A paper describes a structure:
Among diverse BMCs, carboxysomes are specific CO2-fixing BMCs found in all cyanobacteria and many proteobacteria. Carboxysome shells are typically composed of three groups of structural components that form hexamers, pentamers, and trimers. Here, we generated recombinant α-carboxysome shells of [name] by expressing all the shell proteins (involving three [name] hexameric proteins and two CsoS4 pentameric proteins), together with the C-terminal domain of CsoS2 (CsoS2-C) that mediates shell assembly.
Furthermore, we coexpressed [name] and CsoS1B, where CsoS1B was His-tagged. We then performed protein crystallization on the samples with coexpressed [name] and CsoS1B. However, because of defects in the crystal, no usable integration result was obtained. To determine whether the crystals obtained contained both proteins, samples were washed and subjected to SDS-PAGE analysis. The results confirmed the presence of both [name] and CsoS1B proteins in the crystals.
Numbering used by the authors:
A (entry chain B), B (entry chain A), C (entry chain A), D (entry chain B), E (entry chain B), F (entry chain A): 6 to 96
Write the structure that this text describes.
Amino acid sequence: GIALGMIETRGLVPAIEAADAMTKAAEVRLVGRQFVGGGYVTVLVRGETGAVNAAVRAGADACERVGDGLVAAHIIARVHSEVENILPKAP
Amino acid sequence: GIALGMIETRGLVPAIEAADAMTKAAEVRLVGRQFVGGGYVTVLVRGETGAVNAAVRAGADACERVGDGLVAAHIIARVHSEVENILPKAP
Amino acid sequence: GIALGMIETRGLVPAIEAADAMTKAAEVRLVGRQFVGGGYVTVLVRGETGAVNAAVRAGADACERVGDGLVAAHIIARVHSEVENILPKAP
Amino acid sequence: GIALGMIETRGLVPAIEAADAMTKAAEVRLVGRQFVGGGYVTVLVRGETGAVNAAVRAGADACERVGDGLVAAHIIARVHSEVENILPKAP
Amino acid sequence: GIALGMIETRGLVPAIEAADAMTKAAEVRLVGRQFVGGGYVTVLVRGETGAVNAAVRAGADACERVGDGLVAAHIIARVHSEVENILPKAP
Amino acid sequence: GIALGMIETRGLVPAIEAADAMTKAAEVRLVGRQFVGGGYVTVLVRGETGAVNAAVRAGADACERVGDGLVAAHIIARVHSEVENILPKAP
């Protein structure tokens, strides 16, 4: 599956719980954890459409109350192939 | 084409949704995704003048409500040769 | 043990006092100290479930009044295998 | 010419338009684009005194309305030779 | 001596005066100067307990009025050996 | 001489104008320009005690109205040998 799920948080601790809740929620693979600058952290997962939708909803609910909380939660079920050049394949 | 499109966001998730909307909207290549410092991210595209105009406006409309949102959307249809030395050629 | 403890602070001094209180409070190993960006720091410990619970609560109580203070204190007693790829094994 | 022109902005997008407006305004060479930290970006040009004065005035006017806008615009027509050791020669 | 002293400041200038006041105040060795992110800077010294206590008190008083001032001032007279893996030995 | 002068600013443009005013004001060498994190920049000079005093006060008066301005201006006429290990010798 090539659908993409993304959760952005303030700090690394909410991000690490988001990643746990996502990967326990459905069959998805964790491809990236990016320190964006100025406090933001983003975790990326790939999998099938049904799986990525459940994973992102679970991560969003689990990290909102942790540390400085949630920034963004977002799905793109089929990115353009051009966007693959800025998406990591391994953490 | 050598027209330049650029979109700056707060955080990485609005920038990836910006990159996706831009490349599906017209024939543009993604030449870079830059971590600016302090939370800003900038995505950059190249192509013919009309393609880049259609691309930039679609990415702005798409990322506006994603995460912490949109900072800038802007076009330079023919940069001076000088500026090419600070523009990346692939991301 | 493979339970995970995490404490996020504003600045490096509250995080080192957090690491000290955590490791003296129960049998946990210090696997990482991460400079997150924008001032956040995160310290991470591993061990059995009860050791990590006692560790995390002691570090929170210790760093709360140090410097700019505590951001998050949180435990994941069995992370998914997926998340292991973004957790450091030594600092 | 060895006079120096400098424009500092919030974000990379206003900086890239500043560089375009400067180099289209008079004969100057673009020597640097620096990510300062915490959002600031600085572009540096060199050339003759008359040229650097026109270039900086044009860049300042062109970038004020772009993204998060302008921070500083400044000329030094002849830096001390000691200052050359912190001025880049190539972008 | 293995006791640890720590001073965190906003900016590098208050940190450099803190380090001067600490090392002139008692026999301590300067082991680290860390750029934490988002403006914070931390200086670390080691020595005996009596020496580290005088050093930190002097540094704290000397840097409060310099630049953007003091963030934290803190002693741990005997860190756990696990914490040694995140403490530098040389600046 | 081994007296130390230091000026901290918000952004890179006020710091370069600070470096220029300092080196033209008396016989001082520029030993470093440090990107601190979060937007702060620090420039550092060495020389005899009177040269460094004249240098520092001139740089403060010059950069005050440039960009986001001046954070600190400060002199240490004889640092302890300990601190030399965190001071750069050339920029």
